[PDB]
Amino acid sequence: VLQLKLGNSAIVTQEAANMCCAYGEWPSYLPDNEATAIDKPTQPETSTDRFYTLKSVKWEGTSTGWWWKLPDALNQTGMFGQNVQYHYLYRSGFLCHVQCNATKFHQGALLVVAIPEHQLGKYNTGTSASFDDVMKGKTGGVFTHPYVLDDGTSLACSLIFPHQWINLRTNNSATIMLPWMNCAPMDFALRHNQWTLAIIPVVPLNTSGGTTMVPITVSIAPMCCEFNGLRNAITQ
Amino acid sequence: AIQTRAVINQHGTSETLVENFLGRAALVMMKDFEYKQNFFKWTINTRSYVQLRRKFELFTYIRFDSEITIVPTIRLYTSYSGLPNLTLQAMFVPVGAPTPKSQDSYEWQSACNPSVFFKIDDPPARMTIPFMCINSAYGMFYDGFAGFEKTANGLYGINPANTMGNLCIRVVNAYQPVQYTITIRIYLKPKHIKAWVPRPPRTMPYMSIANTNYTGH
Amino acid sequence: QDSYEWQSACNPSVFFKIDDPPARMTIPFMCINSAYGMFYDGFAGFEKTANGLYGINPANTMGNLCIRVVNAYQPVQYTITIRIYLKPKHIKAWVPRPPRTMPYMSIANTNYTGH
Amino acid sequence: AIQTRAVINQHGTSETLVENFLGRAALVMMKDFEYKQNFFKWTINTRSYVQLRRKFELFTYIRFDSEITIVPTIRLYTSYSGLPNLTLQAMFVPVGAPTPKSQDSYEWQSACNPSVFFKIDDPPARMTIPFMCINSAYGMFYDGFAGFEKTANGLYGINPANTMGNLCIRVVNAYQPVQYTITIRIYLKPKHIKAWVPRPPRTMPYMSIANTNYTGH
Amino acid sequence: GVPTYLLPGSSQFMTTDDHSSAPAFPDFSPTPEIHIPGRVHNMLELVQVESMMEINNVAGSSGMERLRVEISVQTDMDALLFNIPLDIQLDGPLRSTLLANIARYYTHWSGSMEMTFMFCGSFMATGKVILCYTPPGGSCPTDRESAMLGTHIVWDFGLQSSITLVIPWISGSHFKSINANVGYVTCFMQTNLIVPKEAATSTYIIGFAAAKNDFSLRLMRDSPDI
Amino acid sequence: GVPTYLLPGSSQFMTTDDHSSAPAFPDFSPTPEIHIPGRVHNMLELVQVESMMEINNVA
Amino acid sequence: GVPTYLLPGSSQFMTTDDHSSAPAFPDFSPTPEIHIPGRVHNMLELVQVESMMEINNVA
């Protein structure tokens, strides 16, 4: 038992704290050798580097799954949301933490997988997903065909992405840290989603005398926020 | 129905390199046009055929240089006098330039558009297209929109920076007394291939060319 | 002629013209075993419909060569004759055998007759 | 109507060199002549097309060597028997030499005029014309007159030293039983380009080929 | 001049040639390469990534049900849980794995594999299973006694939530001729599942597959999956 | 002799190729280059020259 | 470019020529050569092997 203190926020977590780093790379600021070709950004060290805890979701016996697209989930929340509305250029990592509360008589397995550039599927039609289908905000979306991962791929092979297993008889928490995943040094936050954190009940939740509720808590914290400068002097 | 078994002896791993996996010159397009649309026009892309599309979609970002080979064949119609040795012009139009609208269009003379003049009875034309993207790598999957306004929300997963350019082929001495039908085969060989972030392979059949929708079976 | 396998990127293909020098390519040693076996004293499997194939080893097949005319459809007619010339290279051989004396009776079964 | 934005990463300046800016092989002329004027004649110049003229007029003095590529195409008229492999002669006539007046003219045999004999079914002919001006650089703008007398005052801005020579193309075996139409495309690639004294770009449309007059719009 | 003569196969276009070509934009100066994570140098890295297996072979089950086999108190020892043929070419609990999908692009494959099973039951759920492995050419066991006589692990999921199996070697290619079976991995229910009253009476088991660093592939071909 | 074989795209004319060509006048001896002011080496020099702006946007 | 001229017998195919050819599978990595007994390097080794004679010429 320790604390995940990050600036203004802290979460009481379990002793596991495996902290799977995506592709074995800590998030970091944009290197100088690559910042010369583009506009120089100014890094907010506070208070964007803090844990944002969303509303807890309900894990029932028939749940298909939930996905949150970043930074869409935090585009209208707190200082990060305020910053993205005034700066037109954005670049940051993420630190997603998922926690579940259940008794010793509960069972079920969750797959916390961070899918990069997850394009939605819209099964059985030739028309692309609308704006309302992809940008769900902090509410998040719900998988309709979690087997095919809602993109025509397979959930069986989804383990190639940075993933963490939650087995209610072994552990109740997961921690995935995501670096900047893009082909460009910086990107627009309001139109593009770099990551997509998904929780899928691979093994259905079940019990006999339990509450059949088992809330799930999700927390996302930007790691190294960078935004384009907005107060550069024009003199000289 | 015969259950045969053979002893397999293997060594080495250079065969499974991504450079070798994706460095196979494959058909990307094949179109036929008549003597008098009147010419060949096609924007370069990989997703045209399912096999190559699935091969490429195993990765999120791939950066490569494109080598294009044009193999023209000519078939005559209706008396016979032989296959003419017609001159062919193949022009690459970058993403920031206009494309021709007819055979005798002004853009055929543009000095900023590379052009190759080759004949039918010659070896197939061949040229290399360098990596010509705004970003540092092509993106096969785009989880975003092009803009903040309407008439763009209907284009989800389309990044304008991911376009590869237009290839236009015409016959310079097109007008001939009788007839001919010309078939153009385009072969694309990626070079200096680098890939990032592998993804699960596609399982369900494709439903559209640029929207990753899926159906049954 | 208009089959899908003509566009396969994993099958090597050569596009050559009639009025050009003859096409030429080298096929590497592409066998599962370390050497081809001209004589096989065995069967392919343990089941029926294979006992009728004695001396046939699936690992001894060398592959298929397919040739077509891309612009095949022409107004009048033509007849095309294809000659294939095979030149073994880096040849190594083992275990010499007595030469064949009696005439052959079949293409893949080493049967013999009189004379 | 979509307001899209992309991050641009650039480095290096070798692309914007004047050598690269003006070293693009562009069409300078394109003419068609019949079997029996009877041949191709054209004095070499840059101002023929507006795009290249505007590109060159950004500088006052440019000195360069000219590389010429001739791409001939032949189209038949009215029964069919194939495209003949006619031999073509292309001759450069310097500024101090007479030019032919007919197909069977005596100047076609001049030993002081370079000549190239090429066939239709061959790769396009190509030759380099060295810097052949009296002065040390070509002058695109001339604020002066040729002489001190009449019949020259009507030629303002024309310097005789700025002429580049005449290129004449004929078909040696021109007389054929039926017919043919030959189209000649000339591509000019300046080499060893040096420029001086840049000038404001042209804005108003051109009104004449050699008098820098301007009109509205 | 240099006297030269043209060899046979001169003006030919081979789809597998390796020759330089004329650049279309000699002075383009492409975009610099920034650092992007997750670079892949060899496709052998993909087959060593663990991926889920469709162990539930019961016909009539579709979707996520195919990925989990059920152990219940109704299930009576000595029942047969699941059977996994070790051939990555035919239908079975292995065709949905990353290893199978990547290896299907090639013709000849040979190497070791890894098979991992995780028991997703309640904390106090307990029991034993027998995880037998039949070498190639043998016969898959039919009861628990036959499984115990072969190579096996007596997995007790009450204490260990996950188990790992190391398959020694598999091989196969394409030669109608089909490569023979390369072995089986079988599970038998040693005891009966014991759960408390408050816990659920039905549990599930999921499996994963992977390959070791000694795997190899040859003769890249076209995958049948359209 | 030297055995050679022709590569694909052999007898083609690319508008952006870079190859030497046969000189038409091998012994012309062109006019010497005198010194002329205002030589331009890169067109980036033109964009750094201040030029007037049409600020009055009143139609 | 390199000025070359074509010798007589240029685009010909002689059945006894010795020239390299383009590999069809540039990255196949064939099966390793294991040791097999009875390798034959020269066919003169076959004629030195004793073989039976048909001495009985009685028709």
Is F51 exposed, middle or buried, given 0-12, 13-18 or 19+ CB atoms closer than 10 A? exposed
Asked if residues B203 and E225 have their Cβ atoms less than 8 Å apart, the reply is yes
Asked if residues E216 and C6 have their Cβ atoms less than 8 Å apart, the reply is no
CB contact under 8 A, B27 and C44: no
C96: nearest CB among G28, G34, G46: G46
CB contact E10 to C (< 8 Å): yes
**Encoding tokens for residue A186?**
């910086």
User: Residue E103 — left, alpha, or beta (φ > 0 → left; ψ -120 to 50 → alpha)?
Assistant: alpha
D150: closest CA of chain F, how far (Å):
31
Distance between alpha carbon A47 and the CA centroid of its chain, in Å? 18
Contacts of F27 by beta carbon, 8 Å cutoff, 6+ apart: none
Q: In this structure, are strands D40-43 and D166-171 parallel, antiparallel, or unpaired?
A: antiparallel
Asked if residues A218 and A197 have their Cβ atoms less than 8 Å apart, the reply is yes
Rounded distance between C-alpha atoms, residue B182 and residue B176, angstroms: 13
Interface of B with C in 63-82 (CB under 8 A): 71, 73-80
Q: What are residue B169's DSSP bridge partners?
A: B40, B90
CB contact under 8 A, E17 and F3: no
The count of residues in chain E is: 226
Rounded distance between C-alpha atoms, residue C17 and residue C20, angstroms: 5
Rounded (to 5) percent helix, strand, coil in chain C: 5, 10, 85
- Tell me the residue type at E10: S
**Encoding tokens for residue B84?**
């003419």
Cα atoms found within 13 Å of the Cα of residue B111, Cβ hemisphere only: 20
Q: In this structure, are strands B166-171 and B40-43 parallel, antiparallel, or unpaired?
A: antiparallel
DSSP D148-184: SSTTTTT-BS--GGG---EEEEEETT---SS--EEEE
Report the candidate in D77, D44, D55 with the shortest Cα–Cα distance to residue D195. Answer: D55
D83: closest CA of chain F, how far (Å):
19
Report the candidate in B73, B28, G28, G12 with the shortest Cα–Cα distance to residue C15. Answer: B73
- Tell me the residue type at F21: S
D113: closest CA of chain F, how far (Å):
9
Rounded distance between C-alpha atoms, residue E117 and residue E99, angstroms: 17
C111: closest CA of chain B, how far (Å):
24
Asked if residues D206 and D53 have their Cβ atoms less than 8 Å apart, the reply is yes
Partners of chain G (3+ Cβ pairs below 8 A): B, C, E, F
Sheet of G4-6, strands arranged across:
F2-4, E2-6, G4-6
- Tell me the residue type at B71: V
**Encoding tokens for residue D198?**
């840049």
Q: Which residues of B touch C47 (CB under 8 A)?
A: 1-3
CA-angle at A159, arms to A156 and A162, nearest 5°: 155
Neighbours of B157 (CB within 10 A): 22
CB contact C49 to B (< 8 Å): yes
E9: nearest CB among C10, C23, C59: C23
Tell me which of D8, D15, D19 to substitute to probe the interface with E (most E C-beta atoms closer than 10 Å). D15
Q: Is A137 helix (H, G, I), strand (E, B) or coil?
A: helix
Asked if the bond preceding A71 is cis, omega within 30° of 0, the reply is yes
Contacts of A119 by beta carbon, 8 Å cutoff, 6+ apart: A151, B141, B142, B143, B156, B157, B212
Asked if residues E63 and E38 have their Cβ atoms less than 8 Å apart, the reply is no
- Tell me the residue type at B133: C
What is the maximum span of chain F, computed from C-alpha positions, in angstroms? Answer: 77
Query: In the 3-class helix/strand/coil scheme, how is chain F assigned residue by residue?
Result: CEEECCCCCCCCEECCCCCCCCECCCCCCCCCCCCCCCEECECHHHHCCCCCCCCCCCC
Cα atoms found within 13 Å of the Cα of residue E68, Cβ hemisphere only: 22
First-to-last C-alpha distance (Å) of chain D: 26
Asked if residues E35 and A32 have their Cβ atoms less than 8 Å apart, the reply is no
Cα atoms found within 13 Å of the Cα of residue A232, Cβ hemisphere only: 10
Contacts of C100 by beta carbon, 8 Å cutoff, 6+ apart: none
Report the candidate in E138, E164, E50, E147 with the shortest Cα–Cα distance to residue E97. Answer: E50
Rounded distance between C-alpha atoms, residue C13 and residue E15, angstroms: 5
**Encoding tokens for residue E183?**
């072995």
User: Residue A7 — left, alpha, or beta (φ > 0 → left; ψ -120 to 50 → alpha)?
Assistant: left
CA-angle at G46, arms to G41 and G47, nearest 5°: 130
Query: In the 3-class helix/strand/coil scheme, how is D24-77 assigned residue by residue?
Result: CCEEEEEEEEECCCCCEEEECCCCCCHHHHHHHHCEEEEEEEEEEEEEEEEECC
CB contact B132 to F (< 8 Å): no
- Among all residues of chain E, which has the CA nearest to that of A210? E198
Rounded distance between C-alpha atoms, residue D44 and residue B59, angstroms: 53
Place of tokens 């100088």: A32
B188: closest CA of chain F, how far (Å):
14
DSSP A195-215: EEEEEEEEEEEE-SSS-S--E
**Encoding tokens for residue D69?**
């590529």
Place of tokens 């579709």: E62
Contacts of D145 by beta carbon, 8 Å cutoff, 6+ apart: D152, D153, D155, D156
- Tell me the residue type at E198: E
Q: What are residue E126's DSSP bridge partners?
A: E194
Rounded distance between C-alpha atoms, residue E197 and residue B60, angstroms: 48
H or E segment to which residue E47 belongs:
helix E44-47
- Tell me the residue type at A118: H
Asked if residues E186 and E69 have their Cβ atoms less than 8 Å apart, the reply is no
CB contact E5 to C (< 8 Å): no
Q: Is E57 helix (H, G, I), strand (E, B) or coil?
A: coil
Q: What are residue E134's DSSP bridge partners?
A: E184
Q: Is D101 helix (H, G, I), strand (E, B) or coil?
A: coil
**Encoding tokens for residue D133?**
């001006």
CB contact under 8 A, E49 and A160: yes
CA-angle at A47, arms to A46 and A51, nearest 5°: 130
DSSP secondary structure letter of residue B206: B
DSSP A27-46: --PPPHHHHSSSPPEE---S
Is A35 exposed, middle or buried, given 0-12, 13-18 or 19+ CB atoms closer than 10 A? middle
What is the maximum span of chain E, computed from C-alpha positions, in angstroms? Answer: 97
Tell me which of B47, B158, B212, B217 to substitute to probe the interface with A (most A C-beta atoms closer than 10 Å). B212
Rounded distance between C-alpha atoms, residue A156 and residue E56, angstroms: 13
- Among all residues of chain F, which has the CA nearest to that of E11? F6
H or E segment to which residue E100 belongs:
helix E98-103
Asked if residues A205 and E203 have their Cβ atoms less than 8 Å apart, the reply is no
Rounded distance between C-alpha atoms, residue E210 and residue E47, angstroms: 6
Distance between alpha carbon B80 and the CA centroid of its chain, in Å? 34
Asked if the bond preceding A47 is cis, omega within 30° of 0, the reply is yes
Q: Is A81 helix (H, G, I), strand (E, B) or coil?
A: helix
Q: In this structure, are strands A12-13 and B26-34 parallel, antiparallel, or unpaired?
A: unpaired
DSSP secondary structure letter of residue C48: T
Asked if residues E183 and E170 have their Cβ atoms less than 8 Å apart, the reply is yes
CB contact E142 to A (< 8 Å): no
Q: Which spans in G1-59 are helix H?
A: 44-47
State the structure-solving technique: cryo-EM
Q: Which spans in A109-212 are helix H?
A: 131-134
**Encoding tokens for residue D94?**
């310097």
CB contact D24 to B (< 8 Å): yes
**Encoding tokens for residue D46?**
């840059």
